[model samples]
Target: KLPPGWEKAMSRSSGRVYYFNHITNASQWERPSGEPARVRCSHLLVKHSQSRRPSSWRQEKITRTKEEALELINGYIQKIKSGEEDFESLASQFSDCSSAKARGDLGAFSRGQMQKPFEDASFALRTGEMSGPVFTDSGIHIILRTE
Candidate 1:
């Protein structure tokens, strides 16, 4: 069941809506010699006032690497693509978001809720489609379109 006010939004939109799941790893940044390594991280929350439109969203991730944390993230992608995995289970197991308890289910969001590249790919996917092993500056990602 959707939270209060969410259902109302779903009823108001006219455009096609898409649902997606994505996972990103923090980037590692190395300081000059003798300096400790630092990692950058971001946490994100996407909310839609209308089922077809994104009303608000938040991003939180820190980077500690020039290259994305592929090793850790790739494993996640592989698991999901294998079909033995569940998005909510993975989110609860791996996501660092406060919504992790809700299994990274950010409810429903519109096109702009995500970054340009992510939004493009997510919005273009067909229902029940899953994509992953896709890399972004933040990290590797696996996207599932729930329709």
Candidate 2:
């Protein structure tokens, strides 16, 4: 669910977009000595526009627990709210989408391409502004509006 003051955008323009991609892997292995082994892998991908600063690309390795994921997301939200971190920079640093390499850019997308919560937040924000924390199946996210 989304927090208060959060609303979907109504514009039909294509603006900067941040995407987070989460990949999880689990496997088991057997040793020559008959010992069993297990392995787990997780990765985050943050992608954006190429025209933006490369440093603005946000990507990181997160954990499996919902609490940990939420903490990571909330931490960034707090930073954006406090003016200590730029939304683009945070998106570059934490976004997992393919566009993370481009700093969380999704090119110009109309309404419906994104989930309701994200589409709403993206369109509502003004250029260079950002939204607070929003929760989705992927996890919590703080979106930045960069034209």
Candidate 3:
């Protein structure tokens, strides 16, 4: 039996067990938390001229200086932090990474699957939190931890 305020139900189509908390109105695929093996994240990357691969799908050549890239990234952050623009939409419009096609979603990834700085920034964030500009070999990135 589940704990008070918690209920277990199986999906009709998938027939998979899921849990819900009536008190909080929350649902999840797993029974409970014991720390996830991996986390899901989305990011907005801006490549500077010095980046390992400076060209992006939207730009034939990335000619902006690192400082310029940083400024632009900060601008996006400000808009997101102020709730003036949605993160997914902002990333889709300006991110230099191909993941922009998915609105910057990197999907779920484990440690070591990303650059050291990127991995550290992602893992350090609490869920639903966004990071400031992070510098890596790829250039600058603003990361959001979703799960």
Most accurate candidate by TM-score:
3
* Residue 61 error, candidate 3, Å: 0.5
Residue 61, model 1: Cα distance from true site in angstroms? 9.8
User: Which candidate should be chosen as best, given lDDT against the real structure?
Assistant: 3
What lDDT score is found at residue 123 in candidate 1? Answer: 52
Report the lDDT tens digits of candidate 1 across residue range 21-138. Answer: 2321111122111111211112222222221222212323333232334455556666665777766677666653455666665455675556655554455444554444444433
lDDT of 3 at 101: 97
TM-score, predicted candidate 3 vs. hidden true structure: 0.75
**Model 3, span 1-147: residue lDDT tens:** 654345787888898999764432334567743245798999999999999999998899999999999999889988887899999998999999999999999999998899988887777665886777888999899898899
| Candidate 1 overall lDDT versus native | 0.42
Q: List runs of model 2 lying over 4 Å from the truth.
A: 1-62
**For model 1, the run of ten residues with the poorest summed lDDT:** 27-36
Error of 3 at 25 (Å): 32
Model 3: worst 10 consecutive residues (lDDT sum): 20-29
TM-score of 1: 0.47
Q: Give RMSD to native, each candidate.
A: 18.9, 19.7, 13.1
